[PDB]
Design a protein around this ligand. Structure first.
Ligand SMILES: Nc1ncnc2c1ncn2[C@@H]1O[C@H](COP(=O)(O)OP(=O)(O)OP(=O)(O)O)[C@@H](O)[C@H]1O
Ligand SMILES: [Mg+2]
Length: 246
DNA sequence: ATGATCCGACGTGTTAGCCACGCTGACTAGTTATGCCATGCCTCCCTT
DNA sequence: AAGGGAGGCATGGCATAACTAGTCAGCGTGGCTAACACGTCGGATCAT
């Protein structure tokens, strides 16, 4: 009969339930527990494992290079940013408010770290997330359009609840393809937040995309509902380099 | 029983004349298109 | 990579309105028929 239970558990797609079947049976036998409560505990454990696996699969699907969180961010080394605003962002009220989040400042000041932390927080609370660099997004959209499947990739870039655009400005975008980026900003406008990190000021966006009018339209659509952080201070990579040297 | 030869009949080509079919226009009737709503099937995405 | 679930789009049915096809009549043009002549094919008969 035990083999039948194991086969049924595997067939119903409950691997962990079968794995811990003997342990839970022994626990129930040793200590008297109501059947309802025992099933509640088993289903809760299965749901916890399923949630962990789903979060890991979402992390894999969302191309996050390195996993980080707010807990690992040192506000003392970066006093230019108020921790209160970051904590308010972590509440994910902007998702309901459709507000974007723009990080600006010199390289290595934690912009990417903060963006990844916000993305991880969104993923944990069950919100679909996606991470990509601006150059990669533009190149992928261009390649999809050249294949006559731009709409599919546009859906791919629009479907995520939280889209992260990292390093917008380090590499100049091809003028013939900048519009692709605008499309995303045009379709995610008032629909889903965008977390964009850059080292260039807004006035220079025209240089990045090579079209002043398109850059102005993109900025107007992006900044309509957004929270802008102007981070300052010394580079964290250089700080670590000095600490290692010293 | 088969092949060759000779004879007779039928088919074809040509020309002329006549009759029937095709085209066009008008009018009337019947069928198709379209809009709207509801249901079913196909496709896409996610999970194992 | 395969199966299951969910969502979206396409189809069908029904009702109404409009456009097109059918029919009839008249006129014009093309095809069929008839007659005659000639050539070819089929049938019959005789010989091996
Ligand atoms: N305050 C901080 N606390 C902890 N780690 C930090 C902090 N600031 C930066 N780092 C780490 O330093 C490295 C570079 O920082 P990060 O990429 O977040 O900065 P950035 O401004 O987005 O960089 P860049 O523009 O050069 O790409 C990463 O490992 C990041 O985790
Ligand atoms: Mg960075």
């Amino acid at each position: 009969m035990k083999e039948r239970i194991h086969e049924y558990c595997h067939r119903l797609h409950l691997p962990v339930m079968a794995e811990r079947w003997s342990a839970m049976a022994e626990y129930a036998s040793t200590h008297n527990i109501s059947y309802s409560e025992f099933l509640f505990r088993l289903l809760e454990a299965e749901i916890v494992e399923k949630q962990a696996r789903s979060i890991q699969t979402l992390i894999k699907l969302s191309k996050l290079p390195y996993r980080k969180t707010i807990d690992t961010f040192d506000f003392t080394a970066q006093p230019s940013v108020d921790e209160r605003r970051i904590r308010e962002l972590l509440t994910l009220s902007f998702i309901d408010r459709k507000e974007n989040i723009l990080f600006l400042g010199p390289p290595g000041i934690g912009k990417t770290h903060l963006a990844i932390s916000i993305g991880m927080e969104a993923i944990a609370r069950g919100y679909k997330t996606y991470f990509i660099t601006a150059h990669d997004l533009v190149n992928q959209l261009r390649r999809a359009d050249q294949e006559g499947k731009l709409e599919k990739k546009l859906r791919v870039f629009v479907k995520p609840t939280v889209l992260i655009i990292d390093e917008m400005g380090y590499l100049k975008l091809d003028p013939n393809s900048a519009h692709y980026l605008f499309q995303v900003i045009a379709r995610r406008y008032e629909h889903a937040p965008i977390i964009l990190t850059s080292n260039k000021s807004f006035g220079e966006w025209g240089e990045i995309v090579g079209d002043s009018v398109l850059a102005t339209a993109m900025l107007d659509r992006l900044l309509h509902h957004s929270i802008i952080f102007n981070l300052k201070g010394e580079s964290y990579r250089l700080r670590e380099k000095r600490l290692q040297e010293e």
